[PDB]
Short mmCIF file of C-alpha atoms and ligand atoms in Angstrom, two decimals:
data_model
loop_
_atom_site.label_atom_id
_atom_site.label_comp_id
_atom_site.label_asym_id
_atom_site.label_seq_id
_atom_site.Cartn_x
_atom_site.Cartn_y
_atom_site.Cartn_z
CA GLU F 9 -23.20 10.60 12.89
CA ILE F 10 -20.36 9.60 10.61
CA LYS F 11 -18.86 13.20 10.69
CA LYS F 12 -19.26 13.26 14.49
CA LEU F 13 -17.49 9.97 14.84
CA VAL F 14 -14.47 11.03 12.81
CA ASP F 15 -14.29 14.43 14.78
CA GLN F 16 -14.23 12.50 17.99
CA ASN F 17 -11.43 10.08 16.96
CA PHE F 18 -9.27 11.60 14.07
CA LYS F 19 -9.55 15.30 14.84
CA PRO F 20 -7.71 15.26 18.14
CA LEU F 21 -4.61 13.71 16.34
CA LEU F 22 -3.95 17.00 14.44
CA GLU F 23 -3.14 18.89 17.61
CA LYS F 24 -1.50 15.79 19.53
CA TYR F 25 1.11 15.42 16.77
CA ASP F 26 0.97 18.94 15.29
CA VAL F 27 -0.18 17.66 11.94
CA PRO F 28 -0.92 20.43 9.50
CA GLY F 29 -3.56 18.52 7.47
CA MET F 30 -5.60 15.41 7.19
CA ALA F 31 -8.39 13.88 5.13
CA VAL F 32 -10.51 11.04 6.44
CA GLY F 33 -12.84 9.17 4.08
CA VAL F 34 -15.48 6.64 4.88
CA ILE F 35 -17.52 4.42 2.65
CA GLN F 36 -20.52 2.45 3.81
CA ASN F 37 -23.19 0.76 1.61
CA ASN F 38 -21.89 2.70 -1.34
CA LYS F 39 -22.21 6.15 0.27
CA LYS F 40 -19.00 8.12 0.56
CA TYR F 41 -18.15 10.54 3.29
CA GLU F 42 -15.15 12.98 3.06
CA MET F 43 -13.93 14.88 6.19
CA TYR F 44 -11.06 17.46 5.54
CA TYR F 45 -8.96 19.21 8.30
CA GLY F 46 -6.34 21.87 8.19
CA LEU F 47 -3.71 22.72 5.47
CA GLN F 48 -2.12 21.09 2.50
CA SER F 49 0.50 23.91 2.72
CA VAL F 50 1.51 25.72 6.00
CA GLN F 51 3.36 28.44 4.05
CA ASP F 52 0.53 28.98 1.58
CA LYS F 53 -2.33 28.51 4.10
CA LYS F 54 -4.00 26.46 1.36
CA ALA F 55 -6.62 24.19 2.97
CA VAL F 56 -6.95 20.41 2.58
CA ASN F 57 -9.74 19.67 0.07
CA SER F 58 -10.90 17.07 -2.47
CA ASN F 59 -8.19 18.10 -4.84
CA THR F 60 -5.45 17.72 -2.31
CA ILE F 61 -2.67 15.12 -3.41
CA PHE F 62 -0.84 13.10 -0.69
CA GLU F 63 1.90 10.52 -0.92
CA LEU F 64 0.56 7.11 -0.12
CA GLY F 65 3.83 5.60 0.81
CA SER F 66 3.72 1.86 1.05
CA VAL F 67 -0.07 1.75 0.30
CA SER F 68 1.49 1.98 -3.12
CA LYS F 69 2.08 -1.70 -2.80
CA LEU F 70 -1.50 -2.45 -3.11
CA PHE F 71 -1.38 -0.92 -6.60
CA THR F 72 1.57 -2.92 -7.44
CA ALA F 73 -0.19 -6.12 -6.18
CA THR F 74 -3.29 -5.21 -8.22
CA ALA F 75 -1.01 -4.66 -11.26
CA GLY F 76 0.34 -8.13 -10.85
CA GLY F 77 -3.07 -9.69 -10.39
CA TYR F 78 -4.08 -8.03 -13.62
CA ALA F 79 -1.01 -9.34 -15.40
CA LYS F 80 -1.44 -12.82 -14.11
CA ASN F 81 -5.18 -12.89 -15.26
CA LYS F 82 -4.14 -11.52 -18.78
CA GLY F 83 -1.65 -14.61 -18.88
CA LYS F 84 1.34 -12.31 -19.01
CA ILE F 85 2.83 -14.01 -15.88
CA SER F 86 2.49 -16.89 -13.58
CA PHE F 87 3.23 -16.45 -9.85
CA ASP F 88 5.19 -19.74 -10.01
CA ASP F 89 7.60 -18.17 -12.59
CA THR F 90 10.94 -16.79 -11.62
CA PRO F 91 12.22 -13.19 -12.19
CA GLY F 92 14.76 -14.22 -14.81
CA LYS F 93 12.06 -15.36 -17.20
CA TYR F 94 11.37 -11.73 -17.98
CA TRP F 95 14.38 -9.77 -16.94
CA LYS F 96 16.78 -12.04 -19.23
CA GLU F 97 19.84 -10.60 -17.58
CA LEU F 98 19.14 -12.41 -14.20
CA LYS F 99 18.28 -15.53 -16.02
CA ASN F 100 20.38 -18.07 -14.29
CA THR F 101 21.73 -15.89 -11.53
CA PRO F 102 20.65 -17.03 -8.10
CA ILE F 103 17.76 -14.49 -7.86
CA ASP F 104 16.00 -16.62 -10.62
CA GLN F 105 15.50 -19.40 -7.96
CA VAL F 106 12.82 -17.27 -6.01
CA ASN F 107 9.30 -17.02 -7.45
CA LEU F 108 7.18 -14.06 -8.13
CA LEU F 109 4.76 -14.89 -5.33
CA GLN F 110 7.62 -15.03 -2.83
CA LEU F 111 9.09 -11.71 -4.30
CA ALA F 112 5.41 -10.18 -3.79
CA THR F 113 5.10 -11.46 -0.35
CA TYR F 114 8.59 -10.98 1.14
CA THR F 115 9.82 -14.56 1.49
CA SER F 116 13.08 -14.38 -0.51
CA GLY F 117 14.86 -15.15 2.76
CA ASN F 118 17.37 -12.35 2.03
CA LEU F 119 15.90 -8.87 1.20
CA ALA F 120 15.80 -6.05 3.59
CA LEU F 121 13.41 -2.98 3.81
CA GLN F 122 15.76 -0.80 1.66
CA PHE F 123 18.33 -1.11 -1.03
CA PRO F 124 21.62 0.09 0.08
CA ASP F 125 21.98 3.93 -0.24
CA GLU F 126 24.92 3.38 -2.78
CA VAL F 127 22.31 1.92 -5.38
CA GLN F 128 20.47 4.44 -7.40
CA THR F 129 21.11 3.93 -11.11
CA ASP F 130 19.32 1.45 -13.31
CA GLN F 131 22.66 -0.35 -13.82
CA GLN F 132 23.36 -0.31 -10.02
CA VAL F 133 19.90 -2.04 -9.68
CA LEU F 134 20.36 -4.68 -12.28
CA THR F 135 23.99 -5.27 -10.85
CA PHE F 136 22.71 -5.61 -7.30
CA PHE F 137 20.26 -8.37 -8.58
CA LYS F 138 22.92 -9.90 -10.87
CA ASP F 139 25.06 -10.25 -7.72
CA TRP F 140 22.27 -11.32 -5.41
CA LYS F 141 22.99 -14.50 -3.44
CA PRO F 142 20.78 -16.49 -0.94
CA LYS F 143 20.44 -16.63 2.90
CA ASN F 144 17.41 -18.10 4.58
CA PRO F 145 15.57 -21.19 3.17
CA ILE F 146 13.73 -19.50 0.17
CA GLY F 147 9.98 -19.26 0.92
CA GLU F 148 10.16 -19.84 4.57
CA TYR F 149 10.91 -16.47 6.18
CA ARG F 150 8.89 -13.18 5.77
CA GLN F 151 10.93 -9.88 5.97
CA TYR F 152 9.06 -6.72 4.72
CA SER F 153 10.86 -5.22 1.72
CA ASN F 154 10.86 -2.56 -0.91
CA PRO F 155 13.35 -4.24 -3.15
CA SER F 156 11.46 -7.64 -3.15
CA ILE F 157 8.07 -6.19 -4.06
CA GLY F 158 9.94 -3.64 -6.11
CA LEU F 159 11.37 -6.42 -8.14
CA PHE F 160 8.01 -8.07 -8.57
CA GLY F 161 6.77 -4.72 -9.81
CA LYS F 162 9.37 -4.23 -12.37
CA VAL F 163 9.03 -7.93 -13.56
CA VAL F 164 5.25 -7.03 -13.91
CA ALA F 165 6.01 -4.03 -16.11
CA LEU F 166 8.41 -6.24 -18.20
CA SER F 167 5.71 -8.81 -18.80
CA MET F 168 3.34 -5.97 -19.91
CA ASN F 169 5.98 -4.31 -22.25
CA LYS F 170 5.55 -0.87 -20.61
CA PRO F 171 7.58 0.89 -17.97
CA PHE F 172 6.10 0.55 -14.48
CA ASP F 173 4.91 4.27 -14.16
CA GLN F 174 2.81 3.74 -17.46
CA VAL F 175 1.27 0.44 -16.36
CA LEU F 176 -0.42 2.26 -13.45
CA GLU F 177 -1.18 5.60 -15.08
CA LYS F 178 -2.51 4.12 -18.54
CA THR F 179 -3.70 0.78 -17.42
CA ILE F 180 -4.57 0.20 -13.91
CA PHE F 181 -5.71 3.68 -12.68
CA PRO F 182 -8.25 4.16 -15.57
CA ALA F 183 -9.60 0.55 -14.98
CA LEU F 184 -10.27 1.56 -11.25
CA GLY F 185 -11.97 4.97 -12.15
CA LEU F 186 -9.12 6.96 -10.53
CA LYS F 187 -8.86 10.44 -11.92
CA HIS F 188 -6.07 12.04 -9.86
CA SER F 189 -3.63 9.17 -8.79
CA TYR F 190 -0.10 9.42 -10.23
CA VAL F 191 3.38 7.93 -10.11
CA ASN F 192 4.45 11.48 -11.36
CA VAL F 193 2.33 14.49 -10.43
CA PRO F 194 2.26 16.44 -13.77
CA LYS F 195 2.73 20.26 -13.99
CA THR F 196 -1.00 21.17 -14.12
CA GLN F 197 -1.49 19.33 -10.70
CA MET F 198 1.48 20.63 -8.60
CA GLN F 199 -0.76 23.33 -7.15
CA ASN F 200 -2.82 20.34 -5.49
CA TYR F 201 0.25 18.36 -4.22
CA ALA F 202 0.53 18.93 -0.58
CA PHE F 203 3.71 19.43 1.28
CA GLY F 204 4.67 16.73 3.80
CA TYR F 205 6.27 17.81 6.97
CA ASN F 206 9.10 16.07 8.67
CA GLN F 207 9.51 15.86 12.42
CA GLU F 208 11.12 19.30 12.41
CA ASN F 209 7.94 20.58 10.73
CA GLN F 210 9.97 21.41 7.52
CA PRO F 211 7.97 21.09 4.36
CA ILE F 212 9.38 18.09 2.15
CA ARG F 213 8.24 15.67 -0.51
CA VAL F 214 9.42 12.11 -1.35
CA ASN F 215 13.16 11.63 -2.47
CA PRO F 216 13.83 9.76 -5.82
CA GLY F 217 15.00 6.25 -5.19
CA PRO F 218 15.66 2.85 -6.79
CA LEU F 219 12.37 1.07 -7.88
CA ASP F 220 10.52 3.70 -5.89
CA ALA F 221 7.50 3.51 -7.99
CA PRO F 222 6.32 0.00 -7.17
CA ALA F 223 7.20 0.08 -3.51
CA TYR F 224 6.15 3.52 -2.12
CA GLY F 225 5.80 5.95 -5.02
CA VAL F 226 1.93 6.59 -5.67
CA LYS F 227 0.33 9.89 -5.06
CA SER F 228 -3.55 10.04 -4.76
CA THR F 229 -6.52 12.23 -3.43
CA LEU F 230 -9.13 11.31 -0.82
CA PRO F 231 -11.96 10.84 -3.50
CA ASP F 232 -9.69 8.56 -5.42
CA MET F 233 -8.72 6.38 -2.55
CA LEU F 234 -12.41 6.00 -1.59
CA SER F 235 -12.93 4.86 -5.32
CA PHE F 236 -10.04 2.26 -4.79
CA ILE F 237 -11.80 0.97 -1.58
CA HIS F 238 -15.14 0.98 -3.32
CA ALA F 239 -13.50 -1.29 -6.08
CA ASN F 240 -12.14 -3.60 -3.22
CA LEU F 241 -15.55 -3.81 -1.68
CA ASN F 242 -17.29 -4.34 -5.12
CA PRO F 243 -15.04 -5.93 -7.76
CA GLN F 244 -18.02 -7.61 -9.57
CA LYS F 245 -18.98 -4.16 -10.93
CA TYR F 246 -15.60 -3.55 -12.75
CA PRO F 247 -14.18 -4.83 -15.97
CA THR F 248 -13.22 -8.59 -15.96
CA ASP F 249 -9.39 -7.92 -16.04
CA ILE F 250 -9.31 -5.46 -12.95
CA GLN F 251 -11.99 -7.56 -11.08
CA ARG F 252 -9.93 -10.68 -11.31
CA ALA F 253 -6.87 -8.63 -10.15
CA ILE F 254 -8.68 -7.31 -7.14
CA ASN F 255 -9.87 -10.85 -6.14
CA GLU F 256 -6.24 -12.01 -6.55
CA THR F 257 -5.12 -9.47 -3.98
CA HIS F 258 -7.58 -10.58 -1.41
CA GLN F 259 -6.27 -14.22 -1.18
CA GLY F 260 -4.37 -14.96 1.92
CA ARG F 261 -1.06 -16.80 1.16
CA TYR F 262 0.45 -17.68 4.64
CA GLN F 263 0.07 -16.69 8.16
CA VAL F 264 2.56 -15.05 10.53
CA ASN F 265 0.55 -15.75 13.47
CA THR F 266 -2.79 -13.79 13.39
CA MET F 267 -1.79 -11.70 10.34
CA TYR F 268 -2.46 -13.53 6.98
CA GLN F 269 -0.38 -12.05 4.23
CA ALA F 270 -2.04 -11.47 0.96
CA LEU F 271 -0.89 -9.53 -2.08
CA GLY F 272 -0.07 -6.12 -0.51
CA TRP F 273 -2.99 -6.40 1.72
CA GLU F 274 -2.72 -7.65 5.29
CA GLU F 275 -5.82 -9.89 6.14
CA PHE F 276 -7.49 -10.74 9.39
CA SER F 277 -10.28 -12.82 10.61
CA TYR F 278 -13.12 -10.50 11.38
CA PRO F 279 -14.05 -9.32 13.93
CA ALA F 280 -10.40 -8.65 14.85
CA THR F 281 -9.44 -7.40 18.29
CA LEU F 282 -7.54 -4.10 18.25
CA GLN F 283 -4.29 -5.61 19.49
CA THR F 284 -4.40 -8.06 16.54
CA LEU F 285 -4.47 -4.99 14.22
CA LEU F 286 -1.61 -3.39 16.25
CA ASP F 287 0.78 -6.42 16.08
CA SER F 288 0.49 -6.51 12.31
CA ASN F 289 2.77 -3.23 12.49
CA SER F 290 4.88 -4.11 15.59
CA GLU F 291 8.67 -3.84 14.96
CA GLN F 292 8.98 -7.60 15.00
CA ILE F 293 6.53 -8.06 12.22
CA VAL F 294 7.81 -4.93 10.13
CA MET F 295 11.66 -4.82 10.64
CA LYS F 296 13.01 -8.36 11.87
CA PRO F 297 12.59 -11.52 9.55
CA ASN F 298 9.86 -14.07 10.70
CA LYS F 299 8.99 -17.63 9.85
CA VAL F 300 5.77 -18.28 8.06
CA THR F 301 3.23 -21.06 8.60
CA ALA F 302 0.58 -22.31 6.32
CA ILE F 303 -3.03 -21.00 6.63
CA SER F 304 -4.68 -23.28 9.02
CA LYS F 305 -7.96 -21.47 9.75
CA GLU F 306 -9.26 -20.03 6.45
CA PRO F 307 -11.07 -17.01 7.86
CA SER F 308 -14.90 -17.06 7.11
CA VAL F 309 -15.61 -13.29 7.41
CA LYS F 310 -12.38 -11.36 6.58
CA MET F 311 -11.04 -7.65 6.86
CA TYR F 312 -7.99 -6.07 5.32
CA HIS F 313 -5.64 -3.30 6.08
CA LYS F 314 -2.38 -1.53 5.09
CA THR F 315 -0.40 1.36 6.58
CA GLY F 316 2.00 3.55 4.54
CA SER F 317 4.45 6.35 5.09
CA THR F 318 7.06 8.56 3.25
CA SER F 319 9.01 10.85 5.68
CA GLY F 320 6.45 13.70 5.28
CA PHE F 321 3.07 11.70 4.93
CA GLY F 322 1.03 9.05 6.73
CA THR F 323 -1.66 6.66 5.12
CA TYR F 324 -3.94 4.03 6.52
CA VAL F 325 -6.58 1.94 4.55
CA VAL F 326 -9.01 -0.70 5.93
CA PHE F 327 -12.07 -2.52 4.50
CA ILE F 328 -14.56 -5.12 5.66
CA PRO F 329 -16.43 -6.64 2.67
CA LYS F 330 -19.26 -8.20 4.67
CA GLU F 331 -20.06 -5.04 6.58
CA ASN F 332 -19.64 -3.08 3.33
CA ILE F 333 -17.56 -0.53 4.94
CA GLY F 334 -14.07 1.10 4.67
CA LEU F 335 -11.96 3.87 5.79
CA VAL F 336 -9.11 5.89 4.42
CA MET F 337 -6.89 8.32 6.29
CA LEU F 338 -4.28 10.44 4.77
CA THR F 339 -2.02 13.03 6.60
CA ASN F 340 0.77 15.34 5.60
CA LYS F 341 2.78 14.41 8.54
CA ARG F 342 3.59 10.91 9.90
CA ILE F 343 1.69 9.82 13.04
CA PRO F 344 2.42 6.51 14.81
CA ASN F 345 0.89 3.66 12.86
CA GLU F 346 -0.79 2.64 16.29
CA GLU F 347 -2.83 5.77 16.39
CA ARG F 348 -4.07 5.36 12.73
CA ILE F 349 -5.24 1.86 13.50
CA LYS F 350 -7.04 2.67 16.73
CA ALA F 351 -9.01 5.51 15.55
CA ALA F 352 -10.20 3.57 12.47
CA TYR F 353 -11.18 0.68 14.77
CA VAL F 354 -13.39 2.88 16.92
CA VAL F 355 -15.11 4.65 13.97
CA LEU F 356 -15.98 1.44 12.05
CA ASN F 357 -16.93 -0.56 15.04
CA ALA F 358 -19.26 2.31 16.20
CA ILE F 359 -20.99 2.17 12.79
CA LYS F 360 -21.69 -1.56 13.19
B1 QQZ P 1 6.04 1.59 3.46
O1 QQZ P 1 5.61 2.97 3.77
C1 QQZ P 1 7.60 1.51 3.40
N1 QQZ P 1 8.20 2.68 4.02
S1 QQZ P 1 9.82 2.98 4.26
O2 QQZ P 1 9.96 3.06 5.61
O3 QQZ P 1 10.64 1.96 3.57
C2 QQZ P 1 9.99 4.32 3.72
C3 QQZ P 1 10.02 5.58 4.28
N2 QQZ P 1 10.26 6.72 3.78
C4 QQZ P 1 10.58 6.84 2.42
C5 QQZ P 1 10.87 8.19 1.75
N3 QQZ P 1 10.54 9.33 2.29
N4 QQZ P 1 10.94 10.28 1.29
N5 QQZ P 1 11.63 9.52 0.36
N6 QQZ P 1 11.41 8.29 0.75
C6 QQZ P 1 10.62 5.61 1.63
C7 QQZ P 1 10.34 4.43 2.20
O4 QQZ P 1 5.60 0.67 4.58
P1 QQZ P 1 5.41 1.21 6.03
O5 QQZ P 1 3.95 1.82 6.37
O6 QQZ P 1 6.56 2.24 6.22
O7 QQZ P 1 5.53 0.01 6.99
#
């Protein structure tokens, strides 16, 4: 029945949005299911398979959040610290009045989704943070942002003395059991890297950008993402450092109505209505700043999700610890976040 449920709910989306290829993974009671559809490459007629590498987009934030949780539990950082304590060069500039938790969770009060296009170099990055100056009451307003978690990410790599790409590929990925997850796809794996397809069905991949690795720059396979979901459902089986990191990412920090923000993960009381899952990615929540309130109801039974996108790829990831289930969907064309969320909802709810 798992296979038949995904065929009912995910398969039609390939035709509906002319998506070349898709990989849907389900984990239940420590049993993994992998469903593959279509092509990693239209021009090569190479099929999507277990070796196919997709761009995760903002699901990369979950790895950046896990890397921070690890660094905090090795004593390398505190989430009450300010960025200037590690990147000396910002060390009494006004960015050093925002703390790492506030960076991680988007409540600087003045960071947008993107850098400005003009910024590209390492010096242009450091200079934009040297010249960063306040706006909304720090800590009070959530606005989703690549530079913010991007800065948290870089600060985490500074506290670990290793550039960010190495923190993941030598430290975090091996600790999670991930064999084919990369910030940079090496030469021997380029044959498995899918093409993404833009809205003109042109084959494309992700463009270089400032602090792209920590905010949207991880590439993985379906087996690997199911391993990552496994880890989130069962952190007690992993090494102490990574287990503590994973638990750290599950703690709700504030609410923005029915969405609780954690470290990368969005958190909900379970069971959640569909529409509660949809509003987490409504334009209001994703693009416009919003004022945060303190957690009032600590949810008893929780569920977590995150969407991601580069211009050629779509990702969605969801897990419910207490039902011991989760789902990952990866596509090499963006479909609307709404459609990702709904199909997953029907598949998981139908398997109890
Ligand atoms: B993340 O995926 C952030 N997404 S984004 O909208 O900032 C974005 C989109 N596209 C790129 C890109 N394509 N090719 N080079 N770069 C980067 C960043 O969260 P979401 O799921 O989008 O809410």
